[PDB]
Amino acid sequence: QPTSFPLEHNHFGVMEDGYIKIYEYNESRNEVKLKKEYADDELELEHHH
Amino acid sequence: PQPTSFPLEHNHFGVMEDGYIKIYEYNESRNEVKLKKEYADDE
Amino acid sequence: PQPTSFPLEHNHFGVMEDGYIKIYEYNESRNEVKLKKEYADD
Amino acid sequence: PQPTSFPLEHNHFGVMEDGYIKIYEYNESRNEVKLKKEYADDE
Amino acid sequence: QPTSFPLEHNHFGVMEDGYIKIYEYNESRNEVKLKKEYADDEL
Amino acid sequence: QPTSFPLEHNHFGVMEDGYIKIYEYNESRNEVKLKKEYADDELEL
Secondary structure, eight states, X not given: OOEEEEOSTTEEEEEXXXXXXXXXXXXXXXXXXXXXEXXXXXXXXXXXX | OOOEEEEOXXXXXXXXXXXXXXXXXXXXXXXXXXXXXXXXXXX | OOOEEEEOXXXXXXXXXXXXXXXXXXXXXXXXXXXXXXXXXX | OOOEEEEOSTTEEEEXXXXXXXXXXXXXXXXXXXXXXXXXXXX | OOEEEEOSTTEEEEEETTEEEXXXXXXXXXXXXXXXXXXXXXX | OEEEEEOSTTEEEEXXXXXXXXXXXXXXXXXXXXXXXXXXXXXXX
């Protein structure tokens, strides 16, 4: 069920279940870090003021 | 139905899932995601 | 049936869903998504 | 079998579905999509 | 259950059940060909 | 259940079954190589 997309500066995101997860790949250290995690519902809430 | 996504300019991106397309922005400096726009894909 | 999408220039993007190709634009300035064209058979 | 798609230069893009590769072009100015090439699954 | 992604110079990859295939689209010649084929079996 | 995404300098990622693998395609040597592998839970640390 997951889908992924690219972002700037070698970041990328995954959307799986209700959760969006943002990652970074550091080519220099050759490693990835999970940078941020949101439940889509809290995002929806934020958006409906 | 399985979601699909796609990138957009200025660190925005799109997620299309079940009759809806949602556009988000990732702000790298604040390290935040915001939902910016919802769209009913039924035109 | 099972959608897949892809990016295009100037904040346009497209999606393929059961023999149908739909092209859209996101206009960041107006914060609005619009359907721009649709096809099935080329 | 499900589809998967991907971008290319100059507003072209491709779809892979049921063992087939189709490449399309989107002309923003005419607001049109032309299929450009299409391969059965083989080199 | 295919997935694809773009690469530089109009190349693109498709991953199908443990097999990566890299292609190139040559817009000018309107041609696609298989550049490499690889299986997840990694060292 | 697999999804992929592009990165800088001809690298690309494959997300698949809780596992993120990261590759590089050397157009010059015309070859690809796995470079890093992770479990999503590892990253969740």
